[PDB]
Amino acid sequence: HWGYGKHNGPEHWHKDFPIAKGERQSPVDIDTHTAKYDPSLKPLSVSYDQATSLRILNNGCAFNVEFDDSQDKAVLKGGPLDGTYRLIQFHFHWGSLDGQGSEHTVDKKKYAAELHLVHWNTKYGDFGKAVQQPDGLAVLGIFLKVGSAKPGLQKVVDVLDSIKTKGKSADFTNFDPRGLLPESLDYWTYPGSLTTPPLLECVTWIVLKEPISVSSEQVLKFRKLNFNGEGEPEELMVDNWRPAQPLKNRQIKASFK
């Protein structure tokens, strides 16, 4: 029932999901002049060399690339995190225009899109249990800007034709998410939530400072997806992003000076 339109978008979510007006909601604006370098933060470890993707799905909200998380194949460790967090999936949020689309902002700047690499804490055994824990998830957020094409994204872009509408999925094996990372692993980190209902406050956010560049043609293909299901009237999948929420009683820490 919730969505991203005028009668059911983010300003309405609180009626079915009162936690939307919560104490640690995401996304937020990242005030780079207020975030503090934290020297306690240990180095970030992104270990994706044995990653195993399975499938890509249009769920009506975005598209997810799903991974085999039955073992420690692609994991996130270090930084602010205690323990190992398993890659379960990734997705994007993007806009109708290159001037908007990200969820997090940097000094109020909106990027063209935002990549979320979603990982869960292995100490809680599965994702569904992890989301009911304040330290259950770790999401790696990577901003997208429009410029030169991102070669590691092209495999993703090409399959989208086969998952145009809500409920469609396709085989997506042997995709390597290392091709979606920037050079630098400099990040900001804060405690927050999922950015769609149920909006659970179970996330440790890790947002890379360095955006990746994608081409105009690549993001235009994202914009051709549909929110609707097959044989329903076309509603382009665009602007599936939730805006910045109140930081309230939280501190954003930086991994770099």
Ligand X SMILES: *SCCNC(=O)CC(c1ccccc1)c1ccccc1
Residue, CB closest to Zn ion: 116
The size of the chain, in residues, is 257
Q: Kindly tell me which of 116 and 150 has the beta carbon lying closer to Zn ion.
A: 116
Please name the amino acid found at residue 31. Answer: D
Q: How far is the CB of 60 from ligand X (least distance, A)?
A: 4
Q: Taking CB under 6 A as the rule, does residue 59 contact ligand X?
A: yes
Residue choice 24, 86, 110, 116 for contact with Zn ion (CB under 5 A): 116
* Listed residue (92, 54, 40, 100) closest to 243, CA to CA: 100
The letter for the amino acid at 229 is G
Q: Applying CB under 5 A, does 242 fall inside the site for Zn ion?
A: no
- Least Cβ distance, residue 174 to Zn ion (angstroms): 24
Among 9, 60, 179, 182, binds ligand X (CB under 6 A): 60
Q: Which of 131, 181, 208, 254 is the binder for ligand X (CB under 6 A)? A: 131
Which of these ranges, 70-78, 97-105, 194-202, 217-225, lies near ligand X under the rule CB under 6 A? 194-202
Buried b (16+ CB within 10 A) or exposed e, 149-177: ebeebbbbbebbeebebbebbeebeebeb
Q: CB-wise, 140 or 146, nearer to ligand X?
A: 140
Give dist(CA 224, CA 71) in Å, integer: 35
Q: Considering the rule CB under 6 A, would residue 9 count as an interface residue with ligand X? A: no
Tell me how far, at minimum, the Cβ of 48 lies from Zn ion, in Å: 18
Which part of the chain contacts ligand X (CB under 6 A), choosing from 40-48, 59-67, 72-80, 234-242? 59-67
Q: How far is the CB of 3 from ligand X (least distance, A)?
A: 9
Instruction: Name 32's Cβ contacts closer than 8 Å, sequence gap at least 6.
Output: 106, 107, 254
- Residue 61 contacts which entry, ligand X, Zn ion, none (Cβ below 5-8 A, type-dependent): ligand X
Of positions 58, 196, 240, 245, contacts ligand X by CB under 6 A = 196
Contacts to Zn ion by CB under 5 A? 116
Contacts to ligand X by CB under 6 A? 59-61, 118, 128, 131, 194, 196, 198
